[PDB]
Amino acid sequence: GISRDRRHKHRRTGGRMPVHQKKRKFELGRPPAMTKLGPKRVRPVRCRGGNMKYRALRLDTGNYSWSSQKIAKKTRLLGVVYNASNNELVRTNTLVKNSIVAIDATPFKAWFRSFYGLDLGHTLCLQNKHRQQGPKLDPLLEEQFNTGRLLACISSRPGQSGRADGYILEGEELMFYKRKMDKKK
Amino acid sequence: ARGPRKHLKRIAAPHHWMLDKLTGHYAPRPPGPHKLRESAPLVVLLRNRLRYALTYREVMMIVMQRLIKVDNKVRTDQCYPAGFMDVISIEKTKENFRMLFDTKGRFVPHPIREEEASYKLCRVKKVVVGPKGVPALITHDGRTMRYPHPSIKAHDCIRLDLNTGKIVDTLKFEAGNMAMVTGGHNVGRVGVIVHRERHLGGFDIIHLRDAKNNEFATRISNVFVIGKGEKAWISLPKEKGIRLSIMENRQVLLKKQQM
């Protein structure tokens, strides 16, 4: 199969490396699941140890943590927007780690109304306390909410876990990727 | 290759068992509490030390009576690794054997009293926090005592009760505490601890001093604290881990044989 070993390929000197052994199962690799958007499917691959490792193939949804507010919501995905490594993966909408993705933002907007009551577009006391405790929201995130979208980095490896998780972009990361979206335009 | 080796060979066995060269191609192979080369299997006690059994067949006939215990627990497997500072208890004869290191560098079953054969010592490998934030020792034996004192650190011994699970008496690892060696060149030697060098990176070593004022060194993995500065929790074997010299060991031996 796919040999991960160093017995093939050159030495540092530029010399062929002698090989007197057949391929070994512990020097294994497997074909890469370029997982994407769509309705959910996932395949348990039996690995070394007996231990199972769940290969993503299509993922609709994911758990995405807002960092500053300290909450996380289950959310549907819309599209893959940017990738650092390969522009072909954005072309096909392929979910990988470090991949920048669009997100519904109606879970966060419903929470932000309920928690604070400043909104976007007996308790009251609890809301005020929460506001004092924690709601200004960046100027760019204010514009971003108006579309009904957010931007977020995929943090999990979908191929290993069988799960798209991530975190929402904010501050310097958000200002950075807004350059290289606008530059291609 | 391809998996674990089920046979071990004679000659490729440990030397400190003292299995002979002829009279067998293979040797008994001990996994249990202890390592392969820091233990001795229960067959070669019965046939090649205590001389109860003649054959490998007869050890099965002894052990499947459920007469042999270790640590107040019946072990049915004939090739069980019974190592350093384990108690053995046979109910018929009513005699008990604590395995210590002989001064030459061999295993020997030291016979002991009935009240003494309750307890045994376990030097702790490290201390570590388990789930629900509970603390827990782990031993050289591969026990895991839990809820200790905060007092108890790494590289020091604890008297276990065995009749019950719990600890009783701690000991500390410091200068002026009695300490046997369990491995390497100076095995079977007991002396007070003078000093330890740190060497911040790998392998701390300890210089320490025999009761006839001979000075010698070992790594900390080998060193095993018995008791306080002079005196000891345990009973010791013949010679008490002095290790007298080569010409002395000659002189005492041939003086014996003339009767």
Binding site: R6, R12, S67, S68, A84, S85, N98, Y167, E170, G171, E172, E173, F176, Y177, K180 | L200, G201
Partner: protein
């Protein structure tokens, strides 16, 4: 500074900390340099800044080139005994080696100590710990020092 296609960010610092900088203390009797703490560079593979343990060995030697990016190559010299003739023999091995941009102006023919770590690429196993400025005249590869 953001040179590259992905956002270069230091792990250790959370997104809550966006002023704060992470710096490790590598230990083994090696002091953390000041330019690691003060400066704003990233490096994944730095001992003092990122996830890499130093562990096992430590190697001194002479730097012979600094051409490739964030990495050097360090000529070790040693005598090899030849027991028939009862006499020594000068050999060498070029260890290739990581270095971090806390160390400014690492010239060719400098002395450099370097600890072992996990394999970062194919050729490099070792990572730098500390450097020393010295001049060497003519060729560097001629210069035999034993350490």
């Amino acid at each position: 500074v953001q040179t590259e296609r992905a956002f270069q960010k230091q792990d250790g610092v959370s997104s809550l900390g966006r002023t704060q900088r992470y710096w490790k203390d590598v230990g083994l009797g090696f002091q953390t340099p000041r330019l690691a703490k003060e400066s704003k560079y990233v490096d994944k593979k730095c001992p003092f800044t990122g996830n890499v343990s130093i562990r096992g060995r430590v190697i001194k030697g002479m730097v012979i080139s600094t051409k490739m990016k964030r990495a050097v190559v360090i000529r070790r010299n040693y005598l090899h005994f030849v027991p028939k003739y009862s006499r020594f023999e000068k050999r060498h091995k070029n260890v290739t080696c990581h270095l971090s941009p806390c160390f400014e102006q690492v010239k060719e023919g400098d002395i450099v100590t370097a600890g072992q770590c996990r394999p970062l690429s194919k050729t490099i196993r070792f990572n730098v710990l500390k450097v020393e400025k010295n001049q060497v005249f003519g060729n560097v590869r001629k210069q035999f020092r034993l350490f």
